[PDB]
Amino acid sequence: SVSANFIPKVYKKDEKEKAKIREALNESFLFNHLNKKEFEIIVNAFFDKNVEKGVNIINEGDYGDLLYVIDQGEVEIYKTKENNKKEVLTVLKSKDVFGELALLYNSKRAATATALTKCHLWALDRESFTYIIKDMVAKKRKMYEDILSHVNILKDMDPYERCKVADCLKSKSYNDGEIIIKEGEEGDTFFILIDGNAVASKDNKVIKTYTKGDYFGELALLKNKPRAATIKAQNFCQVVYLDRKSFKRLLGPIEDILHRNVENYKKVLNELGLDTTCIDEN
Ligand SMILES: Nc1ncnc2c1ncn2[C@@H]1O[C@@H]2COP(=O)(O)O[C@H]2[C@H]1O
Ligand SMILES: Nc1ncnc2c1ncn2[C@@H]1O[C@@H]2COP(=O)(O)O[C@H]2[C@H]1O
């Protein structure tokens, strides 16, 4: 049932279902950037769609009118290449979002989405998405998409996965002399330097210099220890950063690289006669 410029629609939902939608959208950085008021407009504008196992919810190539959030069930996303060689991009489950690209970029569906089980989906129409959400998401991606493709650790990531990093980024600048990370302090944040110069030290010995595209502050996140080193700006630095939960959601596909760079730290620390127990885990 529908309850009564752009005027949002309100589709009748129990508070129990509304709480599930809020959970899913607060997890998604496509959405959790909205104020309380606008957020609730979006929650109310979702309607539902039930789909049998085996149904292609979306076909690679179609025009795009809705995005979807999974309530229950599992959805495989794939591309069909070559000699009908199915190429599975990913498997999506409860709370996952898909179908945003057509609404974001007015483009043919980039892949096929197939229900692997029966699915209950919540659907958001193009109109609600474009009025409420599109502009700010598109501009944040425009601001960072290119920068991120030149960050060396992110270069081995799918472009689709990388645009998601843009969605959850926060921005901050530091002045000459300002301290970004202090040795011994508790921290929960992963950093990329996007402009300027900074320097890392431990027990007042210099252990690394940083320039544009470098990252730091991952060690406290990979190890659950206090910051292992002090990092200081040397000019007008601009950084972007991720919180711990975004870091472990997004930079899973590059754990292996991060851990490898961690053992170069080890060689530096052993050379300078510094503490190497900050590398091991506790
Ligand atoms: N690697 C990927 N490339 C493109 N789309 C993807 C990928 N992984 C998941 N998807 C989702 O699959 C959807 C297919 O339709 P859309 O292109 O509108 O939006 C797409 C994304 O939500
Ligand atoms: N040799 C090194 N050993 C440990 N950390 C280093 C080294 N060189 C640079 N760093 C960085 O300094 C950061 C300080 O905070 P974290 O320990 O979270 O993560 C650390 C690394 O990103």
Domain ranges of the chain: 8-134, 135-282
Kindly report the protein residue whose alpha carbon is nearest to atom 11 of ligand 2: 216
Of 97, 130, 115, which is closest to residue 58 (Cα–Cα)?
A: 115
- Terminal alpha carbon distance of the chain: 54
> How many whole angstroms separate alpha carbon 71 and alpha carbon 23?
10
Pair 138, 104: CB distance under 8 Å = yes
Backbone angles phi, psi at 135, to 5 degrees: -55, -45
> How many whole angstroms separate alpha carbon 21 and alpha carbon 32?
12
Q: Is 231 in the pocket of ligand 2 (CB under 6 A)?
A: yes
Q: Is 180 in the pocket of ligand 2 (CB under 6 A)?
A: no
Handedness of CA 36, 132, 26, 148 (dihedral sign): negative
Query: How far does the centroid of ligand 2 lie from the alpha carbon of residue 229, in Å?
Result: 5
Pair 154, 162: CB distance under 8 Å = yes
Contacts of 156 (CB under 8 A, 6+ apart): 253, 254, 257
Q: Is 219 in the pocket of ligand 2 (CB under 6 A)?
A: yes
Handedness of CA 266, 272, 273, 274 (dihedral sign): negative
What is the radius of gyration, based on Cα positions, of the chain?
22
Supply 134's token pair: 């599109």
Q: What angle do CA 184, 247, 280 make, to 5 degrees?
A: 45
Of 258, 171, 165, which is closest to residue 219 (Cα–Cα)?
A: 258
Which helix (H) or strand (E) is 272 found in, with range?
none
Pair 106, 67: CB distance under 8 Å = no
Q: What angle do CA 21, 22, 25 make, to 5 degrees?
A: 85
User: Which ligand sits nearest to residue 88's alpha carbon?
Assistant: 1
Q: What angle do CA 91, 48, 52 make, to 5 degrees?
A: 55
Query: How far does the centroid of ligand 2 lie from the alpha carbon of residue 207, in Å?
Result: 9
What's the CATH code, domain 8-134? Answer: 2.60.120.10
Pair 73, 116: CB distance under 8 Å = yes
Query: How far does the centroid of ligand 2 lie from the alpha carbon of residue 175, in Å?
Result: 20
> How many whole angstroms separate alpha carbon 244 and alpha carbon 187?
9
Instruction: Please tell me the experimental approach by which this structure was elucidated.
Output: X-ray
Torsion angle of the four alpha carbons 94, 98, 104, 110, in this order, in degrees rounded to the nearest 10: 170
Pair 194, 238: CB distance under 8 Å = yes
Contacts of 5 (CB under 8 A, 6+ apart): none
Pair 155, 146: CB distance under 8 Å = no
> How many whole angstroms separate alpha carbon 38 and alpha carbon 152?
36
Strand order in the sheet with 215-216: 170-174, 237-243, 189-195, 215-216
User: Which ligand sits nearest to residue 163's alpha carbon?
Assistant: 1
C-beta pairs of 14-18 under 8 Å, 24+ apart in sequence: 17/71, 18/43
Query: How far does the centroid of ligand 2 lie from the alpha carbon of residue 240, in Å?
Result: 17
Q: What angle do CA 96, 101, 102 make, to 5 degrees?
A: 120
User: Which ligand sits nearest to residue 92's alpha carbon?
Assistant: 1
The residue written with tokens 């029966």 in the block is: 118
> How many whole angstroms separate alpha carbon 262 and alpha carbon 8?
50
> How many whole angstroms separate alpha carbon 58 and alpha carbon 102?
11
What's the CATH code, domain 135-282? Answer: 2.60.120.10
Which helix (H) or strand (E) is 44 found in, with range?
helix 36-45
Supply 251's token pair: 């930079």
> How many whole angstroms separate alpha carbon 158 and alpha carbon 154?
9
The residue written with tokens 């709480």 in the block is: 19
Of 152, 140, 134, 259, which is closest to residue 214 (Cα–Cα)?
A: 152
Helices 15-27 and 36-45 pack at an angle, to 10 degrees, of: 120
> How many whole angstroms separate alpha carbon 197 and alpha carbon 220?
21
- Resolution reached, in Å? 2.0
Supply 269's token pair: 């620390």
Which helix (H) or strand (E) is 224 found in, with range?
none
Residue 68: C-alpha distances to residues 88, 113, 120, 142 (Å): 19, 11, 10, 23
Instruction: Give the three-state DSSP class for 43.
Output: helix
